Amino acid sequence: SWRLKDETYSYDGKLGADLKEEGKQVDLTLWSPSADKVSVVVYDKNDPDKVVGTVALEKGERGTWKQTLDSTNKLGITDFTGYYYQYQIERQGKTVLALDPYAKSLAAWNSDDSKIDDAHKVAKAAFVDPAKLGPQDLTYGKIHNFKTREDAVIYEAHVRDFTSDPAIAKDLTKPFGTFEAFIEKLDYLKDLGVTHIQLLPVLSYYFVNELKNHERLSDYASSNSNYNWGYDPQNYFSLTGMYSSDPKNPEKRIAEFKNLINEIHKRGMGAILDVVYNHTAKVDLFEDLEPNYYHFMDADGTPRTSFGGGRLGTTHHMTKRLLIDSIKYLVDTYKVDGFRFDMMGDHDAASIEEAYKAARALNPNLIMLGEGWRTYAGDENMPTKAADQDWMKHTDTVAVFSDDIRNNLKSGYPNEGQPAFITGGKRDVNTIFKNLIAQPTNFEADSPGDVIQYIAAHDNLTLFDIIAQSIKKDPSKAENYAEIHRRLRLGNLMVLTAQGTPFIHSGQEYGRTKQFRNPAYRTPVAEDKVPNKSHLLRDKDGNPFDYPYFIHDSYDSSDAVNKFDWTKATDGKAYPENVKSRDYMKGLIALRQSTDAFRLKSLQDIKDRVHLITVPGQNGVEKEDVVIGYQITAPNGDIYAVFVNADEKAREFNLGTAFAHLRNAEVLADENQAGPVGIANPKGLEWTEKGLKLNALTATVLRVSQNGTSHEST
Ligand SMILES: [Ca+2]
Numbered sequence: 001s002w003r004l005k006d007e008t009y010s011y012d013g014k015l016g017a018d019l020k021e022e023g024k025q026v027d028l029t030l031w032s033p034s035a036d037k038v039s040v041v042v043y044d045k046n047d048p049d050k051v052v053g054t055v056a057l058e059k060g061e062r063g064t065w066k067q068t069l070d071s072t073n074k075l076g077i078t079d080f081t082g083y084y085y086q087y088q089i090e091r092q093g094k095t096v097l098a099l100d101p102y103a104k105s106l107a108a109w110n111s112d113d114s115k116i117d118d119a120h121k122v123a124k125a126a127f128v129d130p131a132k133l134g135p136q137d138l139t140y141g142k143i144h145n146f147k148t149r150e151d152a153v154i155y156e157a158h159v160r161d162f163t164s165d166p167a168i169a170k171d172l173t174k175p176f177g178t179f180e181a182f183i184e185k186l187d188y189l190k191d192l193g194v195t196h197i198q199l200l201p202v203l204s205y206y207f208v209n210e211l212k213n214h215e216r217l218s219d220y221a222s223s224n225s226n227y228n229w230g231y232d233p234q235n236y237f238s239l240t241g242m243y244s245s246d247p248k249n250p251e252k253r254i255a256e257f258k259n260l261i262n263e264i265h266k267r268g269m270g271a272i273l274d275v276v277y278n279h280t281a282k283v284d285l286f287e288d289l290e291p292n293y294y295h296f297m298d299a300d301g302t303p304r305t306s307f308g309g310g311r312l313g314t315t316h317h318m319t320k321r322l323l324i325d326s327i328k329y330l331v332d333t334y335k336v337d338g339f340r341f342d343m344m345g346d347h348d349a350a351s352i353e354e355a356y357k358a359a360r361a362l363n364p365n366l367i368m369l370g371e372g373w374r375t376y377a378g379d380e381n382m383p384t385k386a387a388d389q390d391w392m393k394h395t396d397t398v399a400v401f402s403d404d405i406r407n408n409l410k411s412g413y414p415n416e417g418q419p420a421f422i423t424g425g426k427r428d429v430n431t432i433f434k435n436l437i438a439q440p441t442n443f444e445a446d447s448p449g450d451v452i453q454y455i456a457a458h459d460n461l462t463l464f465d466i467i468a469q470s471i472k473k474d475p476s477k478a479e480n481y482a483e484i485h486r487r488l489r490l491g492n493l494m495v496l497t498a499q500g501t502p503f504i505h506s507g508q509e510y511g512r513t514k515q516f517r518n519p520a521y522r523t524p525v526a527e528d529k530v531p532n533k534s535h536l537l538r539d540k541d542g543n544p545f546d547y548p549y550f551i552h553d554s555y556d557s558s559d560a561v562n563k564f565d566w567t568k569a570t571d572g573k574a575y576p577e578n579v580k581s582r583d584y585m586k587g588l589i590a591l592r593q594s595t596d597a598f599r600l601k602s603l604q605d606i607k608d609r610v611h612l613i614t615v616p617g618q619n620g621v622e623k624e625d626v627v628i629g630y631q632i633t634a635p636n637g638d639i640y641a642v643f644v645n646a647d648e649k650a651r652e653f654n655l656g657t658a659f660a661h662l663r664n665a666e667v668l669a670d671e672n673q674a675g676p677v678g679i680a681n682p683k684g685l686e687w688t689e690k691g692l693k694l695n696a697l698t699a700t701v702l703r704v705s706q707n708g709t710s711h712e713s714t
């Protein structure tokens, strides 16, 4: 029983291998209460296959094992730095090789060798001292335009994707797809105006061959690729080697990642780490350490499983401190600015709340968010409050993604690809309004800061591709490309002016695609050739698009699928529509940052200040429609208004006497541009007798500045 094991062996002392005396000594502590013996196997720093020696540990308090390696070793080592190790643990006459769960770095890891021998089944840890690596001045972000969670603008990027486009090889001075190559494209992000860059999992993950990390994955593939998003966790303190200049040097990834974080900070941004504590890649990672303990279990003690590995049981004392120690070590070592929890609804609320508190005590401006789906499994017959969307009414700490706004604007599970608000499918106007004020309909958000507002992310089809599928129009036709971009800008404007915390998938700003443009796949292929995780996109007549296969889950896809396209993102001669959308997103960000009208800090303040103008059923607005219009009274007394016409015809928005004051407003966004300065000659708008008319697929934002108003009418 894990609960009984806790009463008898709950240990709160230090764990891991602490490299001491400029490398002359190492102190080792492992928790393994059921072990009969525990030795450390030391592998050579130059040839990790070679065992240099094995040293017995001795029993310590509360189920731990401990040893000091020093001067007096007969390993022939005078500096331990860079040597590798595993624990050899004996139980009931059986011996296993286990990974130190508190390993601070690792040997280059290649899962294609995992069957060779027991020493290859899991990574080997490295003795390293992170404090002495990287910029010694690294500290927490001083993040521009940011005071509290509602002021964050999050940008979700995978480290490889962000510099894996062969088109930028000419400009890169560091190995593509690494932490230091990422630095070289940071100015684009500073210029975009985002506040926090959320990176896909940088902690060590299992299914990958890090020895091929400099190889270009240039053939289209959507399965069996060396590429990995990283959701197959191996260790919660060590960085993967996949984004390192040299995976074989266990200190380099740490220095390089410190350098990356410091450069993000120098540019006035912060870093958020995607972390995957909900499950490990392999049951044995932790079962080999202590049997029938670390994972959520059936009543008989069988480890419960998720994504092919063990569900970590964060209610259990040593699993709880694994999560918490990991969060603290990552904040203090790498000075990050927040975390995004994967499958956060799998965890007990108490763990997630305690991680938040611990992290904030180190970095008082740190923020968190997570996938709050209702997914809790836990221990059999041990119901527990989970850190899911229903936790939001009980806490004002960690936010959750809002599937209500994503689904209602452009579809999501179940029902992916069904027309929705920006894709030709009428939706309940009050449901759209409530979402835009950070009041989703599927959970109770009693703070706009509880709500991460988004329409695209790394999973599912990209905003560009899901729009193309939904409206059923082939982007290879110029007029359809333009239309898709109109709809993408409208969706982006809805999110960037919504209450709550907006979240931007890397590439959403320009209309990134995951179309499987393999020359052999121009037209539909035989069923046994169909690319894994694809949809075959069709026009309204049911004709395939040109290159009809689009990847909707690119977790196991090559760079040809996953690269961020820098030519579409930045070369406005070659791709004027994409760059126009990018610049539309930059301006929308600048618009949001210019006023706190779009980022009110309480529910009560949103109730007082935000009012629906397009009342469903009145004045040409149907109960369910593809238009919406609303007003905000900003805290300084200025009046903003957002109007969206997602119909394929011109639509009128009725102002009457109640909203007549919007007639002498500056236009901050129109069909071409967005930003904080009034647009000289606004396009797509027409003032009429009843109010305001927008062109088809057009959105606008208005501002009335009280400093230009009458002294007498008052
Ligand atoms: Ca893969």
Ligand code: NA
Pocket: 416, 417, 460, 461, 466, 552
């Ligand atoms: Na999708």
Ligand code: NA
Pocket: 456, 457, 462, 463, 464, 505, 506, 507, 508, 509, 512
């Ligand atoms: Na996208």
